Amino acid sequence: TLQQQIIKALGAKPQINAEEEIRRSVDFLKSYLQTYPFIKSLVLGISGGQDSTLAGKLCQMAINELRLETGNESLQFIAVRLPYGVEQDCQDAIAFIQPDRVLTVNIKGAVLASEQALREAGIELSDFVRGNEKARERMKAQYSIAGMTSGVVVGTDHAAEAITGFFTKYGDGGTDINPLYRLNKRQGKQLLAALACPEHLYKEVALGVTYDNIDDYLEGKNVPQQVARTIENWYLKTEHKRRPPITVFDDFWKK
């Protein structure tokens, strides 16, 4: 069936062991850095939300352990705040993560400059498109930081996000390594609880579809048709976001 097909493609499980999933993610990160010693830092955008908070914590843990185990003092996790102009959640998240370094980059300036250039070309942007322009400017900022700190960009993509395709292509979807991929929303909360994360930091979507509906679907449970049909529509429509650029050899988009 289609639902069973999505589950397999995203690697989602009905239930997970928090401790085990924390470990899988941390060792994954550690193993990656050890395989490429020229990499010295992990860069992640901090928004104050559940996903980046969990990802941030896992990154700092990987760096902390590597330092102790290898004595390499130059490794560092860099948390980046990317406000649009102008935040207690961010502050609380940072306090919980305790990153080696925090950078704040205001993207408003760049976005307005891009729009002015477009305006002079005769194109006025809509709020919808502007939202994507922001996500992409944040992607540029993180890659520029990574470019100057021998780092890789860490993403927060996970099962409950990948299924709906609700992320900007080459925006927040533009990353190097995604330690959360396979987990649904509630399972993310589970890991945060096991890490003793402040509660208010992790405790819907659209068209009357809630994360619970999405997670239930991802966990292999039965959900109302109207819900399951909407979820499956989003999936099929956003397949191009989960794949490399289309070439004459692809067929997933045919018919």
Spatial distance between the Cα atoms of 195 and 64, rounded to a whole number of angstroms: 15
How buried is 106 (Cβ within 10 angstroms: 0-12 exposed, 13-18 middle, 19+ buried)? middle
Kindly provide the resolution of this structure in angstroms, with one decimal. Answer: 2.3
Q: List the determination method.
A: X-ray
Distance CA 168, CA 224 (A): 28
Location of structure tokens 């560092």: 76
113-142 as b/e: b if 16+ CB within 10 A: ebbeeeeeeeeeeeeeeeebbbbbbbbebb
Query: What is the DSSP track for 150-203?
Result: TEEEB----HHHHTTT-S-TTTTT--SB-TTTT--HHHHHHHHHHTT--GGGT-
Task: Please give the Cα distance from 111 to 106 (Å, whole number).
Answer: 10
Binding residues for deamido-NAD(+), by number, are 32, 132, 136, 169, 176, 240-241
Q: Which domains, from first to last, does the chain contain? A: 1-255 (3.40.50.620)
Starting at the edge strand that comes first in sequence, how are the strands of the sheet with 76-81 ordered? Answer: 101-104, 76-81, 41-46, 151-153
Within its chain, how far is the Cα of 163 from the centroid? 13
Cα 91 from Cα 102, distance rounded (Å): 11
Which residues are annotated binding-site positions for ATP? Answer: 45-52, 81, 156, 185
The answer to whether 92 is a known catalytic residue is: no
Beta strands in the chain (DSSP E): 41-46, 76-81, 101-104, 151-153
Helix (H) or strand (E) holding 119: helix 108-120
Q: Is 120 a catalytic residue?
A: no
Task: Classify residue 255 as exposed, middle or buried by CB count within 10 Å of its CB (0-12, 13-18, 19+).
Answer: exposed
Q: How far apart are CA 78 and CA 143, in angstroms?
A: 12
Closest CA to 153 of 9, 11, 55: 55
- The active-site residue, picked from 133, 157, 161, 219, is 161
* Catalytic-role residue among 21, 51, 215, 219: 51
| Residue type for position 241 | K
| Closest by CA position to 164, among listed 224, 204, 222 | 204
